[PDB]
Design a protein around this ligand. Structure first.
Ligand SMILES: CC(=O)O[C@@H]1[C@@H](C)O[C@@H](c2ccc3c(c2O)C(=O)[C@]24O[C@@]2(C3=O)[C@@]2(O)C(=O)C=C(C)C[C@@]2(O)C[C@@H]4O)C[C@H]1OC(=O)/C=C/C=C/C=C\C=C\C(=O)Nc1c(O)c2ccc(O)c(Cl)c2oc1=O
Ligand SMILES: NC(=O)c1ccc[n+]([C@@H]2O[C@H](COP(=O)([O-])OP(=O)(O)OC[C@H]3O[C@@H](n4cnc5c(N)ncnc54)[C@H](OP(=O)(O)O)[C@@H]3O)[C@@H](O)[C@H]2O)c1
Length: 278
């Protein structure tokens, strides 16, 4: 039996669906229990990782967990997981934990605050550490639905966006096959691309030329603060500024783990084309 925390999430839902396809018993952790929408064959359980007293019920009879990073409550998770007899935890982390002075980066900190307790817990683990999620591009959907111009703080900043389906495939491999215990996988997509190039590729999926223009940092900050705490917005903008005009590393880790090349961002855009069509 596997508990998939965040079974409604972009990554978690695909982990859960893939495990059900394999005939495995899947419990799906949710903060909102009543709403429909979980993948078929997933047993819903209401829990909140910030309320680890909720976790005893969710973990009963569970051998393995797919864990989203929620630092408030990690010590409680570890205690409940140990008490329940969980053998393996696959954590969705971040490549930021691998960067120099990661302790001084809000994003690196948050993810290290979960990795370190798991490493000390005595539980088996696998860490999955993606770079930029291709789904970050969904933030442009209102603009792309509405016309052929998108605003970016750093049109020329490079990332190496990774398809959520690849992340889910790596997680499922770690949950279901040998050789992943104490592994930490830094995942990228197959190509480093600028923000403007990503916008253009979404346009290519739509049959339309979609352009990108710069916006001031203060404007970008206001937009990002709709999604994230100020500390995180500052880290994102600093990271983009550092990648302006500087191609990022492409790693072959997805293929190393799964045997399949990483899915392209262009394929991602085709997969999500409905989000961008008006
Ligand atoms: C609760 C909360 O805010 O959770 C946040 C969650 C919703 O979003 C998390 C998040 C948002 C954006 C990103 C990343 C990321 O982990 C990331 O981990 C990444 O920083 C990303 C990125 O876009 C990146 O594209 C980026 O911003 C810049 C570059 C160059 C590449 C990155 O790929 C690096 C990294 O992988 C960041 C999460 O927040 C934190 O990690 C720390 C929060 C601290 C709060 C203190 C109050
Ligand atoms: N954005 C990036 O470029 C980037 C880069 C590297 C790593 N990451 C990592 O990827 C994560 C995003 O994954 P995603 O795209 O799948 O996100 P998502 O679709 O927003 O899903 C996030 C999931 O987290 C669950 N969750 C959050 N707080 C929780 C809590 N207190 N208790 C239980 N579950 C909780 C939510 O559960 P409910 O749906 O039940 O509320 C939700 O299903 C980030 O948070 C970060 O750790 C992101």
């Amino acid at each position: 039996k596997i508990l998939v925390t965040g079974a409604r999430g972009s990554i978690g839902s695909r982990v859960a669906g893939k495990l059900v396809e394999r005939g495995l018993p899947v419990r799906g952790g949710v903060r909102d229990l009543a709403a429909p929408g979980l993948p078929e064959g997933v047993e819903a359980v209401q829990a909140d990782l910030t309320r680890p007293e909720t976790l005893a019920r969710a973990l009963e009879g569970v051998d393995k967990v797919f864990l989203y990073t929620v630092p408030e409550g990690i010590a409680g998770f570890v205690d409940e997981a140990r008490a329940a007899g969980v053998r393996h935890v696959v954590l969705l982390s971040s490549i930021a934990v691998t960067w120099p002075d990661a302790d001084r980066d809000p994003i690196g900190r948050m993810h290290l605050a979960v990795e370190r307790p798991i490493e000390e817990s005595g539980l088996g683990w696998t860490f999955v550490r993606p770079e930029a999620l291709a789904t970050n591009a969904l933030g442009w959907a209102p603009e792309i639905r509405g016309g052929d111009m998108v605003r970016c703080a750093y049109p020329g900043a490079y990332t190496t966006p990774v398809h959520e389906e690849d992340i889910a495939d790596v997680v499922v491999a770690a949950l279901t096959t040998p050789g992943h215990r104490s592994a930490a996988y830094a995942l990228t997509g197959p190509e480093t691309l600028t923000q403007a190039e990503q916008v253009a590729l979404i346009g290519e999926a739509l049959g339309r030329a979609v352009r990108c223009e710069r916006m001031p940092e203060q404007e970008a900050r206001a937009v990002l603060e709709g999604l994230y705490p100020a500390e995180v917005v500052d880290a994102i903008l600093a990271g983009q500024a550092a990648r302006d005009g500087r191609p990022a590393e492409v790693l072959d880790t997805i293929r190393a783990v799964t045997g399949r090349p990483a899915r392209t961002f262009r394929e991602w855009a085709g997969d999500h084309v409905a989000a961008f069509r008006p």
